[PDB]
Enzyme design. Structure first.
Site, mmCIF file in Angstrom:
data_model
loop_
_atom_site.group_PDB
_atom_site.id
_atom_site.type_symbol
_atom_site.label_atom_id
_atom_site.label_comp_id
_atom_site.label_asym_id
_atom_site.label_seq_id
_atom_site.Cartn_x
_atom_site.Cartn_y
_atom_site.Cartn_z
ATOM 1 N N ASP A 135 0.823 -1.214 0.000
ATOM 2 C CA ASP A 135 0.000 0.000 0.000
ATOM 3 C C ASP A 135 0.858 1.266 0.000
ATOM 4 O O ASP A 135 0.537 2.254 0.666
ATOM 5 C CB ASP A 135 -0.998 -0.011 1.164
ATOM 6 C CG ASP A 135 -2.093 1.016 1.014
ATOM 7 O OD1 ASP A 135 -2.452 1.339 -0.130
ATOM 8 O OD2 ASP A 135 -2.610 1.512 2.041
ATOM 9 N N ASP A 313 -8.292 -6.278 9.390
ATOM 10 C CA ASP A 313 -7.827 -5.199 8.527
ATOM 11 C C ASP A 313 -8.173 -3.823 9.073
ATOM 12 O O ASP A 313 -7.681 -2.818 8.541
ATOM 13 C CB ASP A 313 -8.467 -5.329 7.147
ATOM 14 C CG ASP A 313 -8.103 -6.622 6.452
ATOM 15 O OD1 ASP A 313 -6.907 -7.000 6.470
ATOM 16 O OD2 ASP A 313 -9.013 -7.256 5.882
#
Length: 358
Positions: A135, A313
């Protein structure tokens, strides 16, 4: 490629995931499902160095692996994720990263890398494979319109460069995170992605330890889908093998005959998302193909489990300071605890829905 980092090595299993998994399995009431859950501790995963506080753990894992190798006549391999960029997760509604660009981020991240290198240097008989910064770079392809990403661009590039350059000095085999088929695999994103990754590889000296790219990290895509997931409409690269087949030749042309690893830890169940971009605690996910170098592709060194299934998450609590609304979507399992912490009900379903079955 000739040199697959995994061939001839025994992967060091994470004791933490074994410990998370061990505590999890004894709470599963059905005896047959419980035994399957406990066995997940025997499946190799990556250890996320998501903060400086994780670095002492790395040291213990290297030393433990060294001793296990001697006790069994094996050469051991430790799997890590480098995941502590300043202004980490620039496109997300919220991030957990301890470093900020505005507060000496570059120096603090360099010190984080230096501490990791200083551990790795002490254990030369242990091989290390690192996934570099999930990411991060992928946001610099498609998300430069996100102001936090635009403002983080030079720091992400400099910090990733520092990581690659310095981990190479201790012989770490590295795969840069490269998103997934629904992010960088869109045909129009392939060339901008290749240009960015090649520039990063060049700046870090084209080290042979920079093996290539990691895909599908913490995601849910198929490696090879039997039929395209409806979320993929418009993208001919509907699974990771299509993405990798399309991207790899662009890297080869630049002089980087790159290879790939693909996360399948939460890919056992397809066709579970409303929109392709939905990433948080997707409901009904199952454990996918177990890690293996039998990958089905010239470009892929290993199927891996990078994101440890069962760790959340992100929280679904909209009152948390770290709350990301993606984690409250209809396809997100709720209620969900804070990112990285154990999500028992999700883990139980990952076991129940595992494909292949455990």
């Amino acid at each position: 490629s000739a040199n697959n980092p995994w061939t001839g090595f025994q992967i060091f299993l994470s004791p933490y995931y074994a410990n998370e998994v061990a505590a999890a399995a004894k709470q599963i009431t059905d005896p047959t499902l419980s035994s399957k859950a406990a066995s997940v501790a025997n499946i190799p995963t990556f250890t996320w160095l998501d903060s400086v506080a994780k670095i002492p753990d790395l040291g213990t894992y290297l030393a433990s692996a060294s001793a296990l190798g001697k006790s069994t006549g094996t050469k051991q391999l430790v799997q890590i994720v480098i995941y502590d960029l300043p202004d980490r997760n620039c496109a997300a509604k919220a991030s957990n990263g301890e470093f900020s660009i505005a507060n000496n981020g570059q120096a603090n991240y360099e010190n984080y890398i230096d501490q990791i290198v200083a551990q790795i240097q002490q254990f030369p008989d242990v091989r290390v494979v690192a996934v570099i910064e999930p990411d991060s770079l992928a946001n610099l392809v498609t998300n430069l319109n996100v102001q936090k990403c635009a403002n983080a661009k030079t720091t992400y590039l400099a910090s990733v460069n520092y990581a690659l350059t310095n981990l190479a000095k201790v012989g770490v085999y590295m795969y840069m995170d490269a998103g997934h088929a629904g992010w960088l695999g869109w045909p129009a994103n392939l060339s901008p992605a290749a240009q960015l990754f090649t520039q990063v590889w060049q700046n870090a000296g084209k080290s042979p330890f920079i093996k290539g790219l990691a895909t599908n990290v913490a995601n849910y895509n198929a490696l090879q889908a039997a039929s395209p997931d409806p979320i993929t409409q418009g993208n001919p690269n509907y699974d990771e093998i299509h993405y990798i087949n399309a991207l790899a030749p662009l890297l080869q042309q630049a002089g980087w005959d790159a290879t790939f690893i693909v996360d399948q830890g939460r890919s056992g169940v397809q066709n579970i998302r409303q929109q392709w971009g939905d990433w948080c605690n997707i409901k009904g996910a199952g454990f996918g193909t177990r890690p293996t170098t039998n990958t089905g592709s010239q470009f892929i060194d290993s199927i891996v489990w990078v994101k440890p299934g069962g760790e959340s998450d992100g929280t679904s609590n909209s009152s948390s300071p770290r709350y990301d609304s993606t984690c409250s979507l209809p396809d997100a399992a709720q209620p969900a605890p804070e990112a990285g912490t154990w999500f028992q009900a999700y883990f139980q379903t990952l076991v129940s829905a595992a494909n292949p079955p455990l």
